């Protein structure tokens, strides 16, 4: 037996129970909530320890700068590609037819005024910034940082052990989540928006198979089939959990199983999970086109171009869409139509997000080795 097969069995059984039990499957919700709580309990300390120990291991600060620049460039390019794919798909298909602070301030507040305040509030960007500073400091001092460096390395190992412990509960948590979701979102809810569901799922699948797969094949020069076969656990947990932050422990678990240098995975994975929301951008574009079609607004290519920029910026899930709608002028009431099926879309959004994070890690690791 294996952890993945147990998780897969739990997923299938949860789907079956949710179908047969239907609405009465909410009785199982607490079990899934326990799993989500356990997953989220590990993110902060794991993120900090892993980032610090990864940057410390590098020893070359100049190297970290190249990795960061390449990772950011990749995130921007792939998010733009995701929005483009979403717009093209929502234009070729027509799901909507027939239905009816300042940026400069946001760049600030990424610098914590109090590291412990950021830790307590779970401010991921601030924690990442402080962890980068801490790791750079550790890398630049060397021998003088041995106690703190060793403590944080051991802490990272301990948090990975904890992630291993909780993942043993993963089959039952995934069973509960799938049962609850399939019970709550009955076919009646999907019937009117089946076009949108198909469009979003197909957009995500096309992104995975055309952007990620071709990149892995041609730039990384590595097979995509084994890549997915290795990261299967992370994708499945992201699909079941509907949150990149809660799935981050599993992505970081599988990243080392992938064999990329642990420093590279450690530095990038949390940052991407916080920013690299490719699936979210694709869904935002799809929803913008959907509401435009629903209300009969024939957005021009000039207007469609604005969607790309606004969706790319929005990443730095349903609430964020309002900015995309406002930017080009679609009525904000269109949120109500999609609000009833948000979780089903979130599943694919988070799956694509985690897949993109792992693909980015593979690309940046391969580029320098």
């Amino acid at each position: 037996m294996s952890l993945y097969h147990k998780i897969l069995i739990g997923f299938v059984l949860g789907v079956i129970v949710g179908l047969i039990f239907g609405d009465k499957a909410e009785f199982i919700k607490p079990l899934g909530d326990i799993f989500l709580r356990l997953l989220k309990m590990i993110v902060v300390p794991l993120v900090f320890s892993t980032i610090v120990t990864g940057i410390a291991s590098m020893g070359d600060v100049k190297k970290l700068g190249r990795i960061g620049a390449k990772t950011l460039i990749y995130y921007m390019i792939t998010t733009t590609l995701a929005v483009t794919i979403g717009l093209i798909l929502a234009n070729i298909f027509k799901p909507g037819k027939g239905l009816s602070p300042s940026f400069t301030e946001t760049l600030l507040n990424m610098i914590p005024t109090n590291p412990f305040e950021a830790m307590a509030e779970g401010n991921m960007l601030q924690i990442i910034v402080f962890a980068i500073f801490f790791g750079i400091a550790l890398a630049l001092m060397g021998e003088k940082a041995e106690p703190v460096k060793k403590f944080f390395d051991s802490a990272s190992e301990v948090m990975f052990k904890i992630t291993d412990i909780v993942m043993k509960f993963a089959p039952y948590g995934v069973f509960a989540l799938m049962a609850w979701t399939v019970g709550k979102y009955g076919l009646d809810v999907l019937a009117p928006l089946g076009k949108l569901i198909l469009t979003v799922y197909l957009g995500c699948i096309i992104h995975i198979l055309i952007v990620y797969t071709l990149l892995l094949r041609f730039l990384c020069k590595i097979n995509p089939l084994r890549f997915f076969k290795k990261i299967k656990e992370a994708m499945l947990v992201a699909f079941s959990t509907c949150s990149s932050a809660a799935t981050l422990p599993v992505t970081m678990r599988v990243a080392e199983e992938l064999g990329v240098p642990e420093s590279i995975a450690s530095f990038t994975l949390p940052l991407g999970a916080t920013i690299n929301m490719d699936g979210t951008a694709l869904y935002q574009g799809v929803a913008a086109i959907f509401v435009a079609q629903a209300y009969g607004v024939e957005l021009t290519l000039g207007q469609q171009l604005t969607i790309v920029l606004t969706a790319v910026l929005a990443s730095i899930g349903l609430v964020m869409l309002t900015m995309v709608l406002t930017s080009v002028g679609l009525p904000l009431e269109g949120i109500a139509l999609i609000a009833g099926i948000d979780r089903i879309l979130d599943m694919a959004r988070t799956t694509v997000n985690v897949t993109g994070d792992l693909v980015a890690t593979a690309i940046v690791a391969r580029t320098e080795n």
Side-chain angles (χ1 to χ4, degrees):
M1 253 300 198
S2 82
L3 181 56
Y4 171 58
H5 279 104
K6 292 171 172 284
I7 296 170
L8 187 59
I9 271 180
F11 181 104
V12 170
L13 284 169
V15 164
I16 286 160
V17 171
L19 291 172
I20 265 49
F21 282 26
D23 179 10
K24 302 181 181 291
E26 283 71 314
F27 158 104
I28 292 273
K29 162 87 168 284
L31 203 70
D33 299 351
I34 284 163
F35 182 53
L36 259 62
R37 291 283 237 142
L38 293 168
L39 281 176
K40 288 163 64 69
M41 151 169 102
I42 297 148
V43 182
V44 172
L46 178 65
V47 161
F48 190 74
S49 316
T50 51
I51 288 169
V52 170
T53 194
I55 295 168
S57 303
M58 266 158 214
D60 196 17
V61 156
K62 258 162 198 48
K63 182 177 176 174
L64 193 282
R66 303 193 307 253
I67 303 200
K70 295 145 95 152
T71 300
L72 260 50
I73 286 164
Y74 164 104
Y75 289 163
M76 275 178 0
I77 293 161
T78 47
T79 303
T80 305
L81 263 52
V83 197
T84 283
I85 286 164
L87 287 159
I88 271 53
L89 256 285
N91 278 279
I92 276 43
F93 297 69
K94 307 196 174 187
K97 171 197 74 211
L99 280 75
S100 293
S102 178
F103 306 164
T104 187
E105 184 297 352
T106 73
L107 283 319
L108 278 59
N109 325 131
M110 276 180 6
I111 309 166
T113 56
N114 185 329
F116 310 105
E117 194 195 2
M119 230 90 72
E121 299 189 343
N123 221 301
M124 275 309 144
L125 279 175
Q126 290 172 355
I127 291 157
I128 292 156
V129 165
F130 186 65
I132 288 158
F133 265 101
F134 204 81
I136 286 162
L138 263 51
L140 299 170
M141 314 162 15
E143 163 57 21
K144 211 74 158 286
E146 287 309 329
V148 50
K149 196 192 293 167
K150 278 187 289 190
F151 181 83
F152 275 110
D153 158 86
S154 185
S156 183
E157 301 287 69
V158 165
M159 301 300 323
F160 279 121
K161 181 53 60 191
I162 291 163
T163 313
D164 204 44
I165 289 159
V166 309
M167 281 300 276
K168 285 174 180 183
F169 195 77
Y172 318 101
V174 165
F175 163 80
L177 285 160
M178 287 333 280
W180 168 69
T181 306
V182 179
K184 178 161 184 170
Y185 296 83
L187 283 307
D188 318 55
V189 202
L190 294 325
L193 272 59
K195 308 303 298 189
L196 180 57
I197 288 105
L198 164 156
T199 306
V200 153
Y201 272 54
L202 161 85
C204 289
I205 289 291
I206 274 42
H207 194 68
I208 292 174
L209 266 49
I210 271 45
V211 181
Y212 293 162
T213 300
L214 271 56
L215 284 164
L216 296 165
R217 180 56 181 74
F218 278 138
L219 180 136
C220 306
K221 253 78 46 173
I222 47 192
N223 185 304
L225 191 287
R226 318 145 47 261
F227 190 87
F228 295 127
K229 158 74 150 280
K230 303 240 197 56
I231 63 165
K232 47 194 183 329
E233 279 106 328
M235 297 193 302
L236 192 55
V237 170
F239 192 91
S240 309
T241 315
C242 301
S243 56
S244 313
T247 314
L248 177 54
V250 196
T251 70
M252 290 171 114
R253 256 210 41 211
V254 302
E256 288 43 32
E257 303 287 358
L258 199 299
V260 303
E262 300 92 343
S263 55
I264 301 185
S266 304
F267 150 54
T268 76
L269 251 73
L271 193 40
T274 284
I275 296 143
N276 183 59
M277 311 264 242
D278 279 4
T280 306
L282 183 142
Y283 155 74
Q284 282 176 6
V286 167
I289 296 295
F290 162 85
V291 301
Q293 286 165 358
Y295 286 99
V297 184
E298 296 288 332
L299 299 174
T300 64
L301 296 175
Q303 287 147 307
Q304 152 179 349
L305 174 278
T306 299
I307 285 319
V308 174
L309 188 168
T310 279
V312 167
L313 268 274
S315 301
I316 181 57
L318 194 52
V319 314
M320 293 87 213
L321 170 60
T322 62
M323 158 184 341
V324 196
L325 290 144
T326 300
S327 71
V328 290
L330 287 310
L332 279 73
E333 285 73 18
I335 294 293
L337 305 178
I338 316 176
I341 67 165
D342 191 70
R343 178 168 186 78
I344 300 174
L345 313 178
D346 226 335
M347 286 157 129
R349 293 195 295 248
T350 72
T351 286
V352 170
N353 298 343
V354 300
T355 306
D357 305 295
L358 279 151
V359 169
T361 299
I363 278 183
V364 286
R366 219 282 315 156
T367 304
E368 325 214 75
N369 323 306

